[PDB]
Write a protein that binds this ligand. Structure first.
Ligand SMILES: *[B]([O])([O])[C]([C][C]([C])[C])[N]C(=O)[C]([C][C]([C])[C])[N]C(=O)[C]([C][C]([C])[C])[N]C(=O)O[C]C1=[C][C]=[C][C]=[C]1
Ligand SMILES: *[B]([O])([O])[C]([C][C]([C])[C])[N]C(=O)[C]([C][C]([C])[C])[N]C(=O)[C]([C][C]([C])[C])[N]C(=O)O[C]C1=[C][C]=[C][C]=[C]1
Lengths: 581, 133, 133, 128
C-alpha cells in the first residue's frame, strides 16, 4: 500500500501558539502507576525497596518530592554513650531529652556504669548524633557518594587518644527513623556493598579509623530505617546476583520508559514544566510533547525521560529569549542535529563526489539501496548500496560481509533465514541451481542486525530473474522463512536518511522507501520529510511480504503472467541447464 | 502454621492454606512443598500489610499478584508489541511447518512466552539446519 | 590463506569472485582455479584497493593476455566490476614514479586509477613536470 | 585552563601546620579559581588521572573536597553551589570513554565540533 501524507502526519494541531500556559503541577509519579504503588507498599510495610529505570527519567527528584509528603513519629534522640574506656554504644531516647547533661534517664541503663574514681585518684561526655522537632517530613537522606566514612561515619583522633566524643555520624545515622537513598552504582563502585549488608543484616555500623594506636569497640545496634536504592535495570544485575539482595530489597519500583500519549499526560508535562520555572506557550508545549512521542518512535507513546525533556526545553528557552515557544523548540532540535552533523555532511560530500558510489534514479539488476544506521549517538541513518550476483551453482548463498568477518550473528541469521525461504520456495530443480553472492558494496565496518533481509532477498530474486529494480526506492525490513516481512527499528532515521541522500543529489520526484506495514505506528517523520510526501516529492510504501516489495521494485506483478514469477522460474531453469550443459 | 504463629503473625486458616499452596507452587511440585521458610515469611509480611495486619487467604493471593505486577513491565511491553504486529505471532488458524514453542526468559522472575518457530523443507541431502545454532 | 590478508582484503577477493563467476557463465561454474600472490610480501596487507589489480591479473591469466608492466594499478572493485575510489592516491602514484625514476624512465610509464579519485590528485611538482613532458 | 587534572589541582588542597589545621590552611583549586567564569579541562587528563567521578560529583552535587594525607583530624567542609561553565577539549576518540557514561551527555550538552578541513577558498587563504 501507499501511505498518504494524511496517514503519515502524526503531529498535534496547534491553536493559539503564543498563548501562555497556566497549569497546576502533576503529583510525583504521574503515568508511573506501578512504581508509585510498589513504593506505597514499601512505606506502609517498613520494607526496603529499589527504584529502577533508565537514565534521565527523574527517578530521584520524584522519590524526594514524594517522601517530603510523608509523615511519621518525631525521631528519637540518637546517641553514642560509653560502656568502658574502650567501648561505646548507640542509644535511643525519646526526643529532645538529651539537653539533659535513676536518674530520670532510666532508658540509659548502662551509662551503671559511669561508676569510684577517687578510690584511686583515678582521674567522657555522652554524645548526640541526631535529634528533632517533628516526624514531618521524615528524615530523607540521599548520599549519592557511598563511601564507608560517608555511610558509617568516622572516628577522628585528638592527640593520640580518642573517646566517644570524637565520633562523627554517617548517613546511616542521619537517616534513623526515616529514609536513606543510595545509588546502586555507587555502592558497587565504592566496594561498600558487603559492609552495608552487614549494617542491615546484622546491625553492624563501624566508624572509619586510620591504618593505630588504640581503637574503640562499638556495639551493634538495631537499625531504624527504610533504604531505597536507585539505578538502572543494568545497575541492578551486579546486585541481584547476590541472593542477599532480593532478601534485603523486596519491593521493585520500576519506571516505564514511556507513557501513553494522552491529553492528560501532555497536560501533566505542561504543569511539570511550569513548576520547573519555564515560561511556556501552548505551541511550545505541543512541540515538546510531540518530540517526546518522537524520541520514543511511538505515535501512541511518549518518552518518559523528564530530564531529557527539560534539557531540550532549557535550549529552546535560550533560543526564544527566555520564552518557550513552538519555534524555539523546533530550532533547538534542528541545532542539536547541526551540532552533530559533521559526519553526515562528510558523507553527503563524498556521495556527491562519486567517492561513495550510490544510485538514486534509474534501475539496475540485482542492486538495491538498503538502509543502515551508524552506531554512535545520535544514530544517523544512511542508504548503503547492496549488490547480488547470481551464477550457475550448487545452492550456495554467499554473504560476503559475513564471510569476511564483518557480519554479526543476527546478520548471519538473516542470511540463513532467506536461504531457507529460497531453497524451499523454488523446488522444480531439486536443490537450487545457483550461487548467489551478496555484498554491501562500500562497507568496511561491522554490520549487524536482520533489517537488511528484505533488501537482500529482493536483490537475490532480481539477480535470479534478471529483473531491473528501481534505484530511487530504498528498502528496510526483516524477513522470516515464509517470506513475510517483519518489523524492524530506527525507522525514522532510516527514511530520513534516504531523503537526505536524495535531496543532496536533487530530488527526482519519484523517490521513496519501502518498509514493513508492521512499523506504521513507529513513523514519526520530521516535517521536511512529511512536506515532501504531501508534495508528491517523496513516497512511502509499506508491505507485508517480500514479493510485494519485489513488485514495486521491478514495476510488475508476480503473476497475471507476464509476471515476475515466470521470469524467476525461467532464470532458475537457465541456471539449471548451464549447470549440466 | 505454628511456625508462622511463633513468628508473630495473625494467621487465619485461609491465609495458611494459600501460603502452603504457594510453597507447593514455588517448588513446581504438587506433592512437595518449598522448604525456604524465609521466602515464605517474606511473602507473608507482604500479605499482612495488604490485610491490615491480618494474614488471610485474600491478602496472600493479593500479595502474590502484586509481586507479579511489580515485575510485569517487560511482559506488558511484550504483549503491546504482539498486539501491535511488531512481534508476529498466530494464535488461531493453521499453517504448515509453524508452531508456537514456549520459552522462558532468563531473568527473575522467569516469565514464559510463546516464540514462533518455522520449519522449511526442500530437496536436500539429509541436512537438518538449526538456524539459531 | 597464509594469514597475511586482512578482512577487507579478503572481502575484496570475494567481491571479485562474485564478479567472475557471474560474468562468465557458458560453462556453468567457472572452469578454473586462479591463484593470486603479492610476490614479495612478508607482512600483513589490508584494504580493498588492490581489487582492480587482482581482477585484471585474473582476466589476463584466463585469457593468456600480456599486460603492460610500465603501468601500475590502484582501485577497488564492486560485484558489477565498476571501479571504486580508494585512498592515499598521491602516495601511490608518487611511489611508482620513484621506482621508475630509480630504474630510469622509459617515457611510457604511468598509473591507472579510478576516475572517482580525480579531485584527490594533488601531485608533487616533479611528478606533474614529468606528466607535462 | 588546567591541562593536568589531578584532584589537588582541581579541588585544591589542605596542608598541615604542626599537626593541627583550620580554615586558613586551605589552598584553592582550579574549580575555585574558575567561579563565575571558565574552567577548561582536557578529556584525556580527567581520564588518565582517574578524576572523572570526583569531578561529576563536583558538578552534580556541589561536592568539592580539598585533598588530605593518608590523619589525624580533618575538617568537614560543606557542599556549595558551583558557579561556572566548564569546557572540555579533546579528540573524537578522547570522548568515547566519556560518552559511555550516561552522566556525560547529561552534564555536557553542547557539542562544539571542528571540521578537519576547510573549503579551499580565497577567503580562507587570506584568513590563513
Ligand atoms: B537493521 O537491523 O536495523 C540494520 C541491518 C544492517 C544495515 C544490515 N542494522 C543496523 O543499522 C546496525 C545498527 C546497530 C548495530 C546499531 N548498524 C551497523 O551494524 C553499522 C553498519 C554500517 C554500514 C554503518 N555498523 C556500525 O555501526 O559499526 C561500526 C561503526 C560504528 C560507528 C561508527 C563507525 C563504524
Ligand atoms: B526449555 O529447555 O525449557 C527451553 C528451550 C528453548 C525455548 C528452545 N529453554 C528456555 O526457555 C531457556 C531458559 C533457560 C536458559 C533459563 N531460555 C533461553 O535460553 C532464552 C530464550 C529466549 C527466546 C527468551 N534466552 C535467554 O534468556 O537469554 C538471553 C536473555 C535473557 C534474559 C533477558 C534477555 C535475553
Amino acid at each position: 500500500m501507499r501511505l498518504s501524507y494524511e496517514a503519515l502526519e502524526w503531529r498535534t494541531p496547534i491553536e493559539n501558539s503564543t498563548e501562555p500556559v497556566s497549569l497546576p503541577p502533576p503529583p510525583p509519579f504521574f503515568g508511573q502507576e506501578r512504581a508509585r504503588e510498589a513504593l506505597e507498599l514499601a512505606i506502609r510495610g517498613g520494607f526496603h525497596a529499589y527504584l529502577v529505570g533508565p537514565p534521565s527519567l527523574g527517578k530521584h527528584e520524584a522519590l524526594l518530592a514524594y517522601l517530603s509528603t510523608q509523615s511519621v513519629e518525631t525521631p528519637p534522640d540518637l546517641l553514642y554513650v560509653p560502656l568502658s574506656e574502650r567501648k561505646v554504644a548507640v542509644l535511643t531516647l525519646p526526643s529532645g531529652q538529651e539537653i539533659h547533661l535513676f536518674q530520670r534517664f532510666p532508658q540509659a541503663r548502662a551509662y551503671e556504669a559511669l561508676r569510684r574514681y577517687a578510690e584511686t585518684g583515678e582521674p567522657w561526655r555522652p554524645n548526640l548524633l541526631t535529634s528533632s522537632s517533628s516526624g514531618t517530613p521524615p528524615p530523607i537522606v540521599y548520599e549519592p557518594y557511598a563511601t564507608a566514612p560517608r555511610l558509617f561515619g568516622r572516628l577522628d583522633y585528638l592527640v593520640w587518644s580518642t573517646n566517644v566524643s570524637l565520633i562523627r555520624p554517617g548517613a546511616v545515622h542521619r537517616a534513623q527513623g526515616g529514609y536513606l537513598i543510595l545509588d546502586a552504582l555507587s555502592l558497587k563502585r565504592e566496594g561498600t556493598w558487603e559492609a552495608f549488608k552487614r549494617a542491615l543484616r546484622n546491625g553492624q555500623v563501624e566508624p572509619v579509623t586510620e591504618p593505630a594506636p588504640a581503637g574503640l569497640e562499638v556495639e551493634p545496634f538495631p537499625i531504624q530505617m527504610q533504604v531505597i536504592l536507585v539505578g538502572t535495570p543494568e545497575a541492578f544485575e551486579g546486585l541481584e546476583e547476590d541472593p542477599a539482595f532480593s532478601e534485603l530489597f523486596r519491593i521493585r519500583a520500576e519506571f516505564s520508559p514511556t507513557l501513553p500519549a494522552s491529553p492528560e499526560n501532555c497536560t501533566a508535562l505542561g504543569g511539570w514544566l511550569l513548576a520547573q520555572g519555564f515560561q511556556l506557550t501552548q505551541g511550545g508545549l505541543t512541540r515538546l510533547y510531540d518530540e517526546a512521542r518522537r524520541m520514543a518512535e511511538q505515535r501512541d507513546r511518549m518518552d518518559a525521560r523528564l530530564v531529557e525533556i527539560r534539557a531540550l526545553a532549557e535550549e529552546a528557552a535560550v533560543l526564544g529569549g527566555g520564552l518557550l515557544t513552538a519555534e524555539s523548540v523546533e530550532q533547538a532540535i534542528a541545532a542539536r542535529e547541526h551540532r552533530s552533523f559533521l559526519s553526515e555532511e562528510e558523507f553527503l560530500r563524498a556521495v556527491q563526489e562519486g567517492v561513495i558510489r550510490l544510485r538514486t534514479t534509474g534501475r539496475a539488476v540485482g542492486e538495491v539501496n538498503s538502509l543502515v544506521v551508524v552506531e554512535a549517538a545520535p544514530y544517523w541513518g544512511r542508504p548503503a548500496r547492496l549488490t547480488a550476483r547470481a551464477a550457475p551453482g550448487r545452492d550456495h548463498l554467499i554473504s560476503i560481509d559475513r564471510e569476511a568477518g564483518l557480519g554479526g550473528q543476527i546478520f548471519h541469521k538473516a542470511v540463513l533465514t532467506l536461504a531457507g525461504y529460497l531453497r524451499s520456495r523454488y523446488i522444480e530443480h531439486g536443490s537450487l541451481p545457483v550461487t548467489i553472492s551478496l555484498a554491501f558494496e562500500q562497507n568496511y565496518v561491522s554490520i549487524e542486525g536482520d533489517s537488511a533481509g528484505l533488501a537482500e532477498l529482493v536483490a537475490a530474486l532480481s539477480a535470479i530473474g534478471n529483473l531491473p529494480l528501481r534505484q530511487d526506492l530504498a528498502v528496510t525490513g526483516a524477513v522470516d522463512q515464509t517470506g513475510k516481512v517483519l518489523a524492524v527499528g530506527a525507522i525514522n532515521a532510516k527514511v530520513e536518511g534516504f531523503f537526505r541522500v536524495c535531496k543532496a543529489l536533487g530530488l527526482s520526484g519519484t523517490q521513496g522507501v519501502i518498509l514493513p506495514e508492521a512499523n506504521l505506528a513507529n513513523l514519526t517523520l520530521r516535517a521536511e520529510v512529511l512536506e515532501a510526501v504531501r508534495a508528491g516529492q517523496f513516497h512511502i510504501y509499506a508491505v507485508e511480504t517480500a514479493e510485494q516489495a519485489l513488485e514495486i521494485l521491478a514495476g510488475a506483478r508476480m503473476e497475471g503472467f507476464r509476471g515476475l514469477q515466470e521470469k524467476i522460474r525461467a532464470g532458475l531453469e537457465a541456471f539449471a541447464r548451464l549447470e549440466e550443459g
